[PDB]
Structures are given as structure tokens and as C-alpha cells.
Amino acid sequence: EKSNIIRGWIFGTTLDSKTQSLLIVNNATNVVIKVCEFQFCNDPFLGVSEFRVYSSANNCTFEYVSQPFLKNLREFVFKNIDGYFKIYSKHTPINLVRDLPQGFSALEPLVDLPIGINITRFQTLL
Amino acid sequence: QSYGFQPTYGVGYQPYRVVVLSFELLHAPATVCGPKKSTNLVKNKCVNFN
Ligand SMILES: *[C@@H]1O[C@H](CO)[C@@H](O[C@@H]2O[C@H](CO)[C@@H](O)[C@H](O)[C@H]2NC(C)=O)[C@H](O)[C@H]1NC(C)=O
Ligand SMILES: *[C@@H]1O[C@H](CO)[C@@H](O)[C@H](O)[C@H]1NC(C)=O
Ligand SMILES: *[C@@H]1O[C@H](CO)[C@@H](O)[C@H](O)[C@H]1NC(C)=O
């Protein structure tokens, strides 16, 4: 985390107006999970104003809102099982500063979304 | 061509709004359902729970 500058994802099979594409974004209020299809750009920087991740949403099925995802490790597991998308999570402080430390902490599930779109690739937004 | 609706037409020539509902029973992660029963609670008695 350090200075954050994170939060956002873009899943899906392709990235050009074909099939659908989750956008699990965070803005300190709502982790809105929109399965609406957009057209994307190279380096969309937003917040602080300028919102240009997207161009248009055409036809979509799902929507959602919840609470946000809260020298520390932010750690997730993204899994897809027969039309159910699951996102486990954990956020733990550490004292070591080099790499992933030696220890043990299980991940406690957060959500479960019935979508039904098969996914192949993803990339992270800032 | 335009319908012309007036208060005095009889029964067969009055507006009769229609709403058609179509359901899909295909194989997918179905999400829409109906309401559920919430019968009361008992304790210390041999019962069948669901
Ligand atoms: C964080 O982003 C979400 C997603 O845009 C915002 O949620 C919207 O909130 C407004 C305010 O009532 C609603 O009218 C919209 O329907 C919501 N959804 C969308 C997609 O716009 C949320 O307001 C943002 N948080 C802050 C603090 O601005
Ligand atoms: C969305 O998908 C449907 C599925 O066939 C398609 O007919 C429609 O043109 C698409 N776009 C919109 C805006 O509905
Ligand atoms: C997703 O599934 C459909 C139908 O099963 C298939 O046509 C499509 O190629 C799949 N997407 C992949 C494999 O990325």
C-alpha cells in the first residue's frame, strides 16, 4: 500500500466491446462492481476531477455496492467457479521490510457474485 | 394510423393496456425466485427443521 495509488481491476475475455468486463473499483465509499462493457484507454488516471477510464456502457446485467476494501500487505484471491466469482481478502500489518514474510494467516471471504461470464485476462488500474 | 380514443365508445373500443411477462427457464445461474415461508420457532421438542 504505502502511498496507495491502487484500487481498480478490469477482467474479461477481451477488452473491446465484446462480452462483459467487471470493474471492481474503490473510492472510499462503495466497491461498485459494474459488469457493463466499456471501451478503455492506455493510462487512465482519475480522482485527485478527471474521469476518463471509460467511454460508454452499452448493455449490462449486474450492479452492486458495499463498503470499501479498507508497512502492510494487502492480499487477495480472485477465483471463478461455475458462474460464481469469489474474492477473498486480508489486510495485515508487518514489521519486516524486504519481501513476503514467514508466517501464517488465512483469508476470510468477502463476497460472491453470480455472473456467468468466463474470464481470461486482467489488468490493474491506478 | 392514429387511434382516436374518446370516453363514449362502448366496451370493445376502449384502451385495454396489456403487460406480457416472459420467463426463461434455460440453464444458467438463476437469480430470480419467489418469497419464502418463515414459520415460528419451537424449542425442546422433537421437530423436523428446514
Ligand atoms: C463512489 O463511486 C460510486 C460509483 O459511481 C458512487 O455511487 C454513486 O452515488 C450516487 C450518489 O447517490 C448515485 O446517484 C449513483 O447511482 C451511484 N452509482 C454510480 C455508478 O454513480 C459514489 O457516490 C462515489 N462516492 C463518492 C463519495 O462520490
Ligand atoms: C446488448 O446485447 C443485446 C443482445 O443481443 C443486443 O441485441 C443489443 O444490441 C446490445 N446493446 C444494447 C444497447 O442493448
Ligand atoms: C466462454 O464460453 C463460450 C461458450 O462456452 C465460448 O464460446 C467462449 O469462447 C468462452 N470464452 C473463452 C474461452 O475465453
GROMACS .gro file of C-alpha atoms and ligand atoms in nm:
model
  232
    1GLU     CA    1   0.000   0.000   0.000
    2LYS     CA    2   0.236   0.271   0.128
    3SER     CA    3   0.102   0.569  -0.068
    4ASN     CA    4  -0.190   0.364  -0.207
    5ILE     CA    5  -0.222   0.474  -0.572
    6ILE     CA    6  -0.405   0.144  -0.627
    7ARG     CA    7  -0.763   0.004  -0.646
    8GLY     CA    8  -0.940  -0.095  -0.965
    9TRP     CA    9  -0.948  -0.401  -1.189
   10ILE     CA   10  -1.061  -0.493  -1.540
   11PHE     CA   11  -1.140  -0.856  -1.603
   12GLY     CA   12  -1.297  -1.023  -1.904
   13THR     CA   13  -1.220  -1.225  -2.215
   14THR     CA   14  -1.134  -0.936  -2.448
   15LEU     CA   15  -1.114  -0.561  -2.391
   16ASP     CA   16  -1.301  -0.422  -2.697
   17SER     CA   17  -1.682  -0.411  -2.682
   18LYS     CA   18  -1.701  -0.793  -2.667
   19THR     CA   19  -1.856  -0.989  -2.378
   20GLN     CA   20  -1.857  -0.807  -2.041
   21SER     CA   21  -1.593  -0.678  -1.803
   22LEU     CA   22  -1.607  -0.625  -1.427
   23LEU     CA   23  -1.467  -0.304  -1.279
   24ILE     CA   24  -1.411  -0.365  -0.910
   25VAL     CA   25  -1.322  -0.007  -0.817
   26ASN     CA   26  -1.291   0.172  -0.483
   27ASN     CA   27  -1.349   0.537  -0.394
   28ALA     CA   28  -1.356   0.521  -0.011
   29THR     CA   29  -1.736   0.481  -0.015
   30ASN     CA   30  -1.853   0.196  -0.240
   31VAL     CA   31  -1.684  -0.102  -0.407
   32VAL     CA   32  -1.911  -0.080  -0.708
   33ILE     CA   33  -1.896  -0.391  -0.926
   34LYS     CA   34  -2.028  -0.299  -1.269
   35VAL     CA   35  -2.048  -0.571  -1.533
   36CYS     CA   36  -2.117  -0.313  -1.803
   37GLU     CA   37  -1.896  -0.311  -2.112
   38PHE     CA   38  -1.676  -0.007  -2.179
   39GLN     CA   39  -1.402   0.100  -2.415
   40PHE     CA   40  -1.068   0.156  -2.247
   41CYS     CA   41  -0.753   0.368  -2.279
   42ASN     CA   42  -0.379   0.339  -2.209
   43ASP     CA   43  -0.317   0.513  -1.873
   44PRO     CA   44  -0.643   0.634  -1.715
   45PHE     CA   45  -0.555   0.849  -1.414
   46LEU     CA   46  -0.857   0.967  -1.213
   47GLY     CA   47  -0.951   1.126  -0.883
   48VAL     CA   48  -0.736   1.399  -0.733
   49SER     CA   49  -1.183   1.568  -1.123
   50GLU     CA   50  -1.089   1.395  -1.448
   51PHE     CA   51  -1.272   1.066  -1.513
   52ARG     CA   52  -1.165   0.903  -1.839
   53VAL     CA   53  -1.128   0.530  -1.770
   54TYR     CA   54  -1.442   0.467  -1.976
   55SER     CA   55  -1.609   0.584  -2.294
   56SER     CA   56  -1.953   0.422  -2.296
   57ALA     CA   57  -2.163   0.146  -2.142
   58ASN     CA   58  -2.382  -0.045  -2.385
   59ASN     CA   59  -2.574  -0.337  -2.230
   60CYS     CA   60  -2.527  -0.500  -1.893
   61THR     CA   61  -2.676  -0.722  -1.628
   62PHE     CA   62  -2.530  -0.669  -1.281
   63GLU     CA   63  -2.468  -0.393  -1.029
   64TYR     CA   64  -2.354  -0.377  -0.670
   65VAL     CA   65  -2.246  -0.152  -0.384
   66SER     CA   66  -2.085  -0.226  -0.047
   67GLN     CA   67  -1.832  -0.086   0.198
   68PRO     CA   68  -1.475  -0.023   0.077
   69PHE     CA   69  -1.182  -0.265   0.096
   70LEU     CA   70  -1.035  -0.078   0.394
   71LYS     CA   71   0.439  -0.143   0.601
   72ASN     CA   72   0.133  -0.361   0.540
   73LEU     CA   73   0.031  -0.636   0.299
   74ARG     CA   74  -0.294  -0.611   0.106
   75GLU     CA   75  -0.370  -0.958  -0.020
   76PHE     CA   76  -0.645  -1.109  -0.235
   77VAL     CA   77  -0.755  -1.427  -0.408
   78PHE     CA   78  -0.970  -1.398  -0.722
   79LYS     CA   79  -1.145  -1.721  -0.816
   80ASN     CA   80  -1.415  -1.825  -1.063
   81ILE     CA   81  -1.618  -2.145  -1.019
   82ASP     CA   82  -1.911  -2.237  -1.248
   83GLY     CA   83  -2.055  -1.890  -1.280
   84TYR     CA   84  -1.964  -1.767  -0.932
   85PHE     CA   85  -1.694  -1.503  -0.885
   86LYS     CA   86  -1.534  -1.503  -0.540
   87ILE     CA   87  -1.291  -1.256  -0.386
   88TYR     CA   88  -1.124  -1.348  -0.060
   89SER     CA   89  -0.910  -1.092   0.117
   90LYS     CA   90  -0.684  -0.989   0.402
   91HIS     CA   91  -0.506  -0.672   0.514
   92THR     CA   92  -0.227  -0.729   0.763
   93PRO     CA   93   0.048  -0.514   0.916
   94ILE     CA   94   0.406  -0.639   0.904
   95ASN     CA   95   0.735  -0.545   1.068
   96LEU     CA   96   0.967  -0.689   0.803
   97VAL     CA   97   1.053  -0.470   0.504
   98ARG     CA   98   1.209  -0.698   0.240
   99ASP     CA   99   0.952  -0.938   0.094
  100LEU     CA  100   0.666  -1.169   0.185
  101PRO     CA  101   0.746  -1.270   0.545
  102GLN     CA  102   0.733  -1.613   0.707
  103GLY     CA  103   0.405  -1.662   0.889
  104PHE     CA  104   0.051  -1.783   0.857
  105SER     CA  105  -0.284  -1.609   0.817
  106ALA     CA  106  -0.589  -1.746   0.640
  107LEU     CA  107  -0.806  -1.540   0.406
  108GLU     CA  108  -1.165  -1.464   0.505
  109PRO     CA  109  -1.415  -1.446   0.216
  110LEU     CA  110  -1.577  -1.116   0.125
  111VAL     CA  111  -1.839  -1.159  -0.150
  112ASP     CA  112  -1.986  -1.399  -0.405
  113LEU     CA  113  -2.125  -1.278  -0.737
  114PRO     CA  114  -2.333  -1.486  -0.981
  115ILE     CA  115  -2.222  -1.353  -1.319
  116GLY     CA  116  -2.163  -1.643  -1.556
  117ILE     CA  117  -1.905  -1.485  -1.790
  118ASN     CA  118  -1.584  -1.677  -1.847
  119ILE     CA  119  -1.272  -1.468  -1.791
  120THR     CA  120  -0.925  -1.498  -1.941
  121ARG     CA  121  -0.716  -1.187  -1.873
  122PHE     CA  122  -0.699  -0.891  -1.637
  123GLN     CA  123  -0.501  -0.578  -1.559
  124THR     CA  124  -0.481  -0.336  -1.268
  125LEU     CA  125  -0.574   0.033  -1.274
  126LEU     CA  126  -0.424   0.302  -1.054
  127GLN     CA  127  -5.250   0.549  -3.835
  128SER     CA  128  -5.358   0.711  -3.510
  129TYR     CA  129  -5.610   0.564  -3.271
  130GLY     CA  130  -5.869   0.811  -3.154
  131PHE     CA  131  -5.987   0.736  -2.801
  132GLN     CA  132  -6.296   0.905  -2.658
  133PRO     CA  133  -6.495   0.841  -2.339
  134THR     CA  134  -6.801   0.712  -2.530
  135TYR     CA  135  -6.708   0.406  -2.739
  136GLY     CA  136  -6.860   0.104  -2.568
  137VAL     CA  137  -6.657  -0.190  -2.437
  138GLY     CA  138  -6.466  -0.331  -2.734
  139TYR     CA  139  -6.320   0.002  -2.850
  140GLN     CA  140  -6.167   0.130  -2.524
  141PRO     CA  141  -5.799   0.125  -2.426
  142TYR     CA  142  -5.705  -0.210  -2.273
  143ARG     CA  143  -5.343  -0.188  -2.158
  144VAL     CA  144  -5.157  -0.517  -2.176
  145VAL     CA  145  -4.847  -0.637  -1.993
  146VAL     CA  146  -4.684  -0.961  -2.106
  147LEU     CA  147  -4.431  -1.134  -1.881
  148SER     CA  148  -4.191  -1.383  -2.038
  149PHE     CA  149  -3.980  -1.618  -1.826
  150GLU     CA  150  -3.663  -1.800  -1.932
  151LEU     CA  151  -3.606  -2.149  -1.790
  152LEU     CA  152  -3.267  -2.205  -1.953
  153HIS     CA  153  -2.961  -2.349  -1.779
  154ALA     CA  154  -2.764  -2.067  -1.612
  155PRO     CA  155  -2.700  -1.929  -1.260
  156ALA     CA  156  -3.066  -1.845  -1.199
  157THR     CA  157  -3.118  -1.546  -0.971
  158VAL     CA  158  -3.488  -1.452  -0.962
  159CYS     CA  159  -3.714  -1.652  -0.730
  160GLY     CA  160  -4.022  -1.613  -0.513
  161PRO     CA  161  -4.084  -1.534  -0.146
  162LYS     CA  162  -4.015  -1.780   0.134
  163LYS     CA  163  -4.201  -1.906   0.440
  164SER     CA  164  -4.095  -1.807   0.792
  165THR     CA  165  -4.288  -2.034   1.029
  166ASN     CA  166  -4.239  -1.983   1.401
  167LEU     CA  167  -3.975  -2.126   1.637
  168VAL     CA  168  -4.009  -2.401   1.899
  169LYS     CA  169  -3.761  -2.549   2.143
  170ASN     CA  170  -3.706  -2.864   2.349
  171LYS     CA  171  -3.936  -3.074   2.129
  172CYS     CA  172  -3.865  -3.339   1.867
  173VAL     CA  173  -3.924  -3.146   1.543
  174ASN     CA  174  -3.834  -3.153   1.174
  175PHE     CA  175  -3.628  -2.849   1.077
  176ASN     CA  176  -3.557  -2.698   0.735
  177LIG     C1  177  -1.803   0.632  -0.546
  177LIG     O1  178  -1.837   0.584  -0.675
  177LIG     C2  179  -1.972   0.535  -0.684
  177LIG     C3  180  -1.990   0.484  -0.825
  177LIG     O2  181  -2.004   0.593  -0.916
  177LIG     C4  182  -2.072   0.644  -0.647
  177LIG     O3  183  -2.200   0.583  -0.640
  177LIG     C5  184  -2.300   0.670  -0.697
  177LIG     O4  185  -2.358   0.753  -0.596
  177LIG     C6  186  -2.457   0.844  -0.645
  177LIG     C7  187  -2.500   0.929  -0.527
  177LIG     O5  188  -2.626   0.887  -0.477
  177LIG     C8  189  -2.573   0.766  -0.706
  177LIG     O6  190  -2.668   0.857  -0.760
  177LIG     C9  191  -2.521   0.674  -0.816
  177LIG     O7  192  -2.627   0.592  -0.865
  177LIG    C10  193  -2.409   0.585  -0.762
  177LIG     N1  194  -2.356   0.499  -0.867
  177LIG    C11  195  -2.294   0.543  -0.978
  177LIG    C12  196  -2.248   0.437  -1.073
  177LIG     O8  197  -2.276   0.663  -0.999
  177LIG    C13  198  -2.037   0.708  -0.513
  177LIG     O9  199  -2.119   0.823  -0.491
  177LIG    C14  200  -1.891   0.750  -0.511
  177LIG     N2  201  -1.856   0.806  -0.381
  177LIG    C15  202  -1.839   0.936  -0.360
  177LIG    C16  203  -1.804   0.977  -0.221
  177LIG    O10  204  -1.852   1.018  -0.450
  178LIG     C1  205  -2.679  -0.571  -2.595
  178LIG     O1  206  -2.690  -0.711  -2.626
  178LIG     C2  207  -2.808  -0.748  -2.698
  178LIG     C3  208  -2.805  -0.899  -2.711
  178LIG     O2  209  -2.838  -0.940  -2.843
  178LIG     C4  210  -2.808  -0.678  -2.833
  178LIG     O3  211  -2.926  -0.714  -2.905
  178LIG     C5  212  -2.804  -0.527  -2.811
  178LIG     O4  213  -2.796  -0.461  -2.936
  178LIG     C6  214  -2.684  -0.488  -2.725
  178LIG     N1  215  -2.685  -0.345  -2.698
  178LIG     C7  216  -2.783  -0.283  -2.630
  178LIG     C8  217  -2.766  -0.135  -2.614
  178LIG     O5  218  -2.880  -0.342  -2.584
  179LIG     C1  219  -1.668  -1.866  -2.294
  179LIG     O1  220  -1.765  -1.967  -2.322
  179LIG     C2  221  -1.825  -1.957  -2.452
  179LIG     C3  222  -1.930  -2.066  -2.460
  179LIG     O2  223  -1.899  -2.173  -2.372
  179LIG     C4  224  -1.717  -1.969  -2.559
  179LIG     O3  225  -1.777  -1.951  -2.688
  179LIG     C5  226  -1.608  -1.866  -2.537
  179LIG     O4  227  -1.503  -1.886  -2.630
  179LIG     C6  228  -1.554  -1.876  -2.395
  179LIG     N1  229  -1.453  -1.774  -2.371
  179LIG     C7  230  -1.322  -1.800  -2.366
  179LIG     C8  231  -1.282  -1.944  -2.385
  179LIG     O5  232  -1.239  -1.712  -2.346
   0.00000   0.00000   0.00000
